[PDB]
């Protein structure tokens, strides 16, 4: 559904039986979630932001529901201050930017 | 126009006479450009992001032509890895996120 950007474009996700809200972020290549618990195996990874770079856990083939849209992707979990859905998943849910 | 998120949504801006490319960014509350010379007056501000806080300088009332459209607003200049057009300006160009 169309959102304007007068306010932060925030949605509910369900991941891992947990309900979260996350920011739809066209600038973010990758989806990055704060610390929460996920089952399984993961690889260490670093990503950059402004500020600097953080070190995250790289889980993949994770099912997320974002609004009513399912999508399976790579998720990075670590010290971001806000959960971010980025392009690897906004592409799966079909989001566009219009101006 | 309409951007699919398979590529980074980069766009051409003209600011202060200069021609830059910049990221259209729904998750970013403000616009922050890399260092460049702007005339006039500014004051120091700090912003956060993933993995830290940079100190930035704030110019208000800068004209920016973004794609083709003119908008005027505050632009923060500072050590970002990339020019980022955030919601303060995206609202002025009419951008909508649309799934
Ligand atoms: O995949 C990623 N990186 C990779 N590395 C290797 C492979 S992929 C990646 C994933 C998510 C975010 C980012 C890094 N990132 C951010 O750090 N910011 C902070 C930001 C950017 C611009 C303005 C503000 C702002 O106004 N902040 C304010 N603070 C106080 C008041 S306003 C904040 C937000 C997200 C955010 C919002 C609020 C708080 C924290 C973060 C942007 O929305 C994101 O697009 C992006 C911008 C960016 C993109 C590339 C390089 C550098 C910066 C990178």
A56: Cβ–Cβ under 8 A, 6 or more apart, which residues? Answer: A32, A44, A45, A46, A47, A76, A77, A78, A79, A80
The reply to whether A29 belongs to the active site is no
DSSP-assigned states of every residue in A66-91: ETTEEEEEEEEESS-SS-EE-HHHHH
User: Is the distance from the beta carbon of residue A81 to the nearest atom of ligand 1 less than 6 Å?
Assistant: yes
**Taking CA atoms, what residue in B is nearest to A93?**
B99
Across the interface, whether the CB atoms of B3 and A32 are under 8 A apart is answered no
Preferred mutation among B10, B27, B67 to probe A, highest tally of A CBs within 10 A: B27
Phi, psi of B2 (to 5 degrees): -125, 125
Please give the residue range of the domain that contains residue B53.
1-99
Kindly report the number of other CB atoms within 10 A of residue B56's CB atom. Answer: 20
Q: Both tokens of residue A52?
A: 């600097």
Counted domains in chain A: 1
Q: What is the resolution of this structure in A?
A: 1.8
- State the Cα–Cα distance between residues B33 and B56, nearest whole angstrom: 9
Phi-psi sector, A23: left (phi>0), alpha (psi -120 to 50), beta: beta
Closest CA to B91 of A8, A78, A13, A28: A8
Can you give the CATH number for the domain in which A66 is found? 2.40.70.10
| Ligand 1 centroid to residue B50 C-alpha, Å | 6
Q: CB A99 to CB B91 under 8 A?
A: no
Nearest Cα residue to A30 out of A7, A4, A3, A54: A54
Q: Determination method here?
A: X-ray
């Amino acid at each position: 559904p169309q959102v304007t950007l007068w306010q932060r474009p925030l949605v509910t996700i369900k991941i891992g039986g947990q309900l979260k809200e996350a920011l739809l972020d066209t600038g973010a290549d990758d989806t990055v979630l704060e610390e929460m618990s996920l089952p399984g195996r993961w690889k260490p990874k670093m990503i950059g932001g402004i500020g600097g770079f953080i070190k995250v856990r790289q889980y993949d083939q994770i099912l997320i529901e974002i609004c009513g849209h399912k999508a399976i992707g790579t998720v990075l979990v670590g010290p971001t201050p806000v959960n971010i859905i980025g392009r690897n998943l906004l592409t799966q849910i079909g989001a566009t930017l219009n101006f």
